[PDB]
Structure formats: structure tokens, C-alpha cells
Structure 1
Amino acid sequence: KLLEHKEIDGRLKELREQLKELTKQYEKSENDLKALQSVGQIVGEVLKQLTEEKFIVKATNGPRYVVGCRRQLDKSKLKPGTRVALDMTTLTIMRYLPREVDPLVYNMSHEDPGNVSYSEIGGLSEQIRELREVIELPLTNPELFQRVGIIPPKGCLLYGPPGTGKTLLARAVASQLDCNFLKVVSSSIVDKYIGESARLIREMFNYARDHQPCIIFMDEIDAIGGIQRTLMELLNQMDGFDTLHRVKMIMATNALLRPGRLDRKIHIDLPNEQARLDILKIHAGPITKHGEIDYEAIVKLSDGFNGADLRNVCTEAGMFAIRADHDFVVQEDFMKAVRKVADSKKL
């Protein structure tokens, strides 16, 4: 009879678990009914602060209303520009919301606190040294700079062959700090005349301060808005007045070279063949190669003088292997591409 009684316990215990689940299911049904009475609240920005109990809010896609805060809200949060959710009937500010998204801000705010070793950018040990000598001392010991008296070390320049790794230099030196490391390459800062400024010159330093150390990286200044007087006024504005969080502009392209207009200028040498080996090794690392592969004689026949020249030569080598099931590139395969790209670049 014990087995039968235990059998009944199985049916009884099954019902108990089921009813518990049903109660959990119903308790959800009650929750959604309560949320049903909930009503939407319009979204707007607090343009101005008229008084303690009066606010000016511009609805997202409607008129601007003068409204008042609910009550138990920290009026400190409701600062000009803060998003708020007005009540649909009383139009009273009920709660503050964080601001996000925005079309233009994708590269001027994003921070990249990564760790890219200088081995990634090969053949520029000397060039990277100057970056540290230029961006390390100002960051580490502002006291010694202030002790001497000369505050602003800003400026800098990396004129040289196009795209031979200029961005990487600002990345390899990003080993310490350089978190935000924004890029504004020839755009949004002067735009020929003044087109871009504050909202395209300060918003920069803005996140360039509300965050860890960053690099403005106004690369390719030779293509800004495509004017010189505006640029001269551009580089002599309050930019260096603040210099927040040791953010150093690192323009790089090809009496404005004096201190206060352009700091140390470094010319990036054409990829040295002995350095060219360094590039082929790092660049060609990821591609599945075979043991017999040799990165020795390629440079002798590969003097393209462009960093990207080595990247596609490594990649275009794979496309050589795309035909046929070759999972690895052969020494001849690389020579096949080098004799192609090193000669194709001539056209």
C-alpha cells in the first residue's frame, strides 16, 4: 500500500507545482493590467530655467511649453539640454532621461582604451620614440612643465607619405591613456571659413575632458574644407587656453611652423626595406601561411614605399590562393603578387 500512497503523492505534487506556475502566470496577468492604465509621457529638452518652479521645455517635435517640475525631482539634474518626460495633460516635468545617439557623434566621442603594441606598427621605432618624447612628458609631469613656466606643448605634425601608418603611430603611442583618441581628419573644425567650431571645435575638448586622456588627431589637415586666416585664428583660439586632460592635437599630412602654431614636426620616412620585412611579417601574420613561406626576398623585390602596399600584397596573395584549395601561401605566391602590386602601383 506504500507504493500506492507514494503514487498519489506524485499526482498531488504535480498539481502543487502546476498551481504555483499558474499563480506565477496569473501574477503576470495582474501586472500587465496595472501597466495598462499607464499613459505615455512626451519627451522634450529643458531649454532654459525660468525660476525654481518654472521650466521651459521644447517638445521633441512640437511647440515649446513653460512647465514646472513634479516635486520630488532633483532640479540640479534638469539643466539646459537635459531630456525630460513631460506629463501628457499637465505638461509637468516628471522625470529626467539620459541622452544618447546623435548622427554626427560617432568618431568625436568614442573612446578606444585598447592596447596595440608598437610591434603592430613595424619599422617606426624611431618615429614612435618621438611620439612618446612628445606626448609622454606633457601627460606624466605637468608640474615640471608648470614649474618651468611653459604650459602649452601642443601642436605636433606627422607630414610624410600618404597613409603609411600615420593613424597607427597615434595608436601605438596609445599604449598608455589615449582612451578617446578621436579622429577629425580634414573635417569639422574650420571647414574652409569657420564652418565647424565649438559644436565642431569644443564638443571635441568636451568629451576630450569628461573622460580619460584622449588625442584629437586632426589628421590630414591638408584637406580641411576641400581659409588660411581662419585656420590661423583656428589654432590661436581658446584651444590652448584650457588644454584639458593633457589632450594633444596630432595633426599629420604634408610662419605657422613656430611654437604655438605647430610643435615638433616629424617626417615619416618611406618604408625602409629592412623595415619592409617588419611590415610584411606583422601584416602577413594572420593569413594562413605554410612553413616554407619566407618574408626575406619579398622586400628586395617589394619596394612599393606604401604601408597599404604591403597589406594588400599580403591580402592579394590570399586571393591568389582563393583559386585552388591552397590553405597556405607559397614563397612563389608572394613573389607573384609582389611582381604584380609593385608593378601595378606604377599604373
Structure 2
Amino acid sequence: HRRYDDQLKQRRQNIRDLEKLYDKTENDIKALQSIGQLIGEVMKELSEEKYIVKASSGPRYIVGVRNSVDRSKLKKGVRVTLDITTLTIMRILPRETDPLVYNMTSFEQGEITFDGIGGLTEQIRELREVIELPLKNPEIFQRVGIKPPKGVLLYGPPGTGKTLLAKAVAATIGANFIFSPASGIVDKYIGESARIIREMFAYAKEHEPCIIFMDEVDAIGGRRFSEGTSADREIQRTLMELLTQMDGFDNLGQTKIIMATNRPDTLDPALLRPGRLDRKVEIPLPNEAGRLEIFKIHTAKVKKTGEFDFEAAVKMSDGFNGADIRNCATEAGFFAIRDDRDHINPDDLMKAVRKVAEVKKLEGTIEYQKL
């Protein structure tokens, strides 16, 4: 009696799979009947039923309206949806101008924390006052009467963890952040770099808890006035846009500007003036007491012997930065591979530190011309 029933139960797996494919294909034909619709921003208002919306293709047209939309949201500064044939307003959408995914992706996955940035504790509280303090309790600045600092400058020798300060805040505060590299906005067609900058600050009025960073700007942060220079107007006007949002009458106060650079001398002296970057946070080379904490950070996940002394590499370290200390633990791992050792010999740790000391040979000291 159950012989024929078992053959019918096995067919039920195929029937349920076809039933999902019957409505999926049927919904595809219904989607093909819908055509495209233009998108434009409302400029002015001519009549009640007649508005002027600038098309995305670059010309302008006088479009219509219908009874399916609210005329209150059709005012100026609102991006609407036009028609590709009749050229009439269809729907109403929020303003989105080039939502670049690379700048909006902050890598929300937690990796570096306040423990891995250790040794900078003296300079860590500098960012907490210009970031954590105004966002958590903005009323403190109103009691004394001081204005909340907008821009913050990060400069110093490379490899000291200035970039790690950007990743440590994203994994703790949790606010929406935007990574803005210097070479990502330099795309040029016609006045493109000046428009992209206005696109990043356009999200400041939408999402209030936002802080826009800047990654190692050696180019568009300088002054470089115009003499010759093979038509630099795109980079020249790029500097004018970064000095606009932090200057003109537009008021935000919830947006902080974190600018990182390898040296203040390559930055526009006008940008260094107060009113744009209020506080300049310097990240110099850690002291002898600050280096010892760094060795324990990189070797925390490294398997080695139970007896360990990192005070030897403290004196061995001369002019090293937070990054070069990581290379000492990386190079020491290959010394035990030739001897077939899972745990790294503490004596081999000093071999890599002495090796890294001969890797530089180039500069390594900036003093008089660095603030």
C-alpha cells in the first residue's frame, strides 16, 4: 500500500521546486511591462501644476505633476522621478548623489581596538576631546562658550599608527564614517573632483553622527598657487572645495574632519590657519616607555616560550616607529622555520631587531621643519 505512496512523495520535492519556478517566470513578464523613468532635481516652481526640474542629462524641462504625489514635497531642492517620454513627475525619492560604495564602506568588522593602539595613550586623549567629548556631551562647550572644533590635523613620521586611529574609532563609537582618500576623489572628466567633494559633505545634513576622514594627503592639501603648472585648475579648485564647507555660512557642528598627512610643510598654510583645523594632534615616535607596550601587542598572538623579556629590544630600538616593531616580530618568525621550531626563540627576536635597524638607511629624522 505504501509502495506507490513513496514514489509520489519523492515527486513532491520536484513539484514544489517547479511551483517556485512557475511564479518566478510569471513575475518576470510582469516586470518587462514596466519601462524606465528619468530622475531629476526640482529647481524652481513656475505654476501650481507646472514645475521646472533639471534632468540628469544636463538640460532642463518644464514638467507636470499628478494627483498621486504630494505638492508639498515637490518644492525646490527635492530629487524627483521624471518620465522618459511624457516628461512628467512620477514619484518622489530622497536625494542620493553618486553613493560610492568604496567611501561608504568603513570595514565595520572589528580588528584593531584601543588595546592595539597602546603606547599612544598620551595622544589618544587628544582625539577623545575633539570626537568623543563633543558627540557624547555637546552642552559642555556651550557652558564655557567655546566653539566645538571641526577639523583635526594628524601629522608625523610614517608608521606611527596614524591610520590605526581611524580604524580604532570605527570599531568602538559605531557612528557612520566615510573614508576619503586623497587619490580617490581626483577622477577628472569636467570639474569632477570639485563635485565629488560636495557629494561627501552632502551626507552631513542627512546623517548627523558622521565624521569624514582624510587618508595621507600629500597633494590636494598644499597651497601651490597658479603659475604655469600645466593646467592644474582641477586640483586648484579641489583645494577650494575643501576650504568651502568648513568656511561658508553652512552650519553643521556634528561633522568632524580628520586629515592625516606625512608632514605639515606640504599643506596649504591657509588650511593650517585656525577656523578650519582647530587642533593639530601630533603623533611623534613613541618614547622608551611607549615602545615596550608595542612589543606585547604584536607578540600577544605569537606563540613563544614562557620566559620572555622585551626590555632588550627597547634599547635596541633607535628611531623606530609602531610599524617597524611589527616587522621585527614578522622577521623573527622565519628564523625558527629553518630550524623547525614552532615557538620563536627569544634570542632570535633580537636578531630581527638588529636586521631592521639596517633596513632604513634613508632619512628617518625630521625635526626642525616639523611642527
Q: TM-score, normalised by structure 1?
A: 0.72
| Maintained 8 Å contact 1:321/1:329 | yes
Residue 180 of structure 2 is aligned to residue 184 of structure 1? yes
Cα deviation for residue 278 of structure 1 reads 1.1
Structure 1 SS opposite 2:260:
coil
CA distance in 1, matches of 2:239, 2:222: 17
Matched ranges for 1:32-71 at <5 A? 34-35=26-27, 37-38=29-30, 39=32, 41-43=34-36, 45-48=38-41
For 1:24 and 1:70, locate their aligned partners in 2 and report how far apart those are by CA, in whole Å.
43
Structure-2 residue corresponding to 1:108: 103
Pair 21,58 (structure 1): closer, same or farther in 2 beyond 3 Å: farther
Find the counterpart in structure 1 of residue 233 from structure 2. none
1:265-292 Cα offsets, whole Å, 9 max, x none, are: 2322212222112112112323333334
- In 2, Cα distance between equivalents of 1:168 and 1:142: 26
Alignment of 1:137-156 (within 5 A): 137-156=133-152
Q: Give the Cα separation in 2 of the matches to 1:211 and 1:323.
A: 54
- The total of aligned residue pairs comes to 331
Offset at 1:153? Answer: 1.6
Percent identity between the two aligned chains: 52
Which residue number corresponds to residue 260 of structure 2?
252
Structure whose CA Rg is larger:
1
* Alignment correspondent of 2:160: 164
Unmatched runs of 5 consecutive residues or more in structure 1: 1-7
- Following superposition, the deviation at residue 224 of structure 1 comes to 2.3
RMSD: 4.5
**Which amino acid is 2:216 matched to?**
E
**DSSP 3-state at the match of 1:265:** strand
Cα distance in 2 for residues equivalent to 1:83 and 1:325: 67
Which protein is richer in strand relative to its size?
A: 2
Q: Does 1:196 align with 2:211?
A: no
Contact kept, 8 Å, 2:285 with 2:320, in 1: the verdict is yes
Shift of 1:133: 2.0
8 Å CA contact 2:160–2:284 kept in 1: the answer is no
| SS of residue paired to 1:249 | strand
Distance 1:228 1:26, change over 3 A: closer
TM-score, normalised relative to structure 2: 0.68
Match for residue 277 of structure 1?
A: 292
What is the distance in 2 between the residues matched to 1:143 and 1:245? Answer: 12
Question: Deviation string for 1:22-53 (max 9, x for gaps)?
Answer: 65355346435634644265555412569869
Cα distance in 2, alignment partners of residues 187 and 297 from structure 1: 41
In the aligned structure 2, how far is the partner of 1:27 from the partner of 1:271? 67
For 1:17, the equivalent position in structure 2 comes to: 9
Q: How far did 1:312 drift? A: 1.6
The answer for the alignment partner of 2:246 in structure 1 is 239
1:127 alignment counterpart: 123
Q: Is the 8 A contact 1:46 1:81 kept in 2?
A: yes
Q: Secondary structure at the match of 2:39?
A: strand
C-alpha deviations, 1:181-203, integer Å up to 9, x for none? 33324346799xx8733x33232
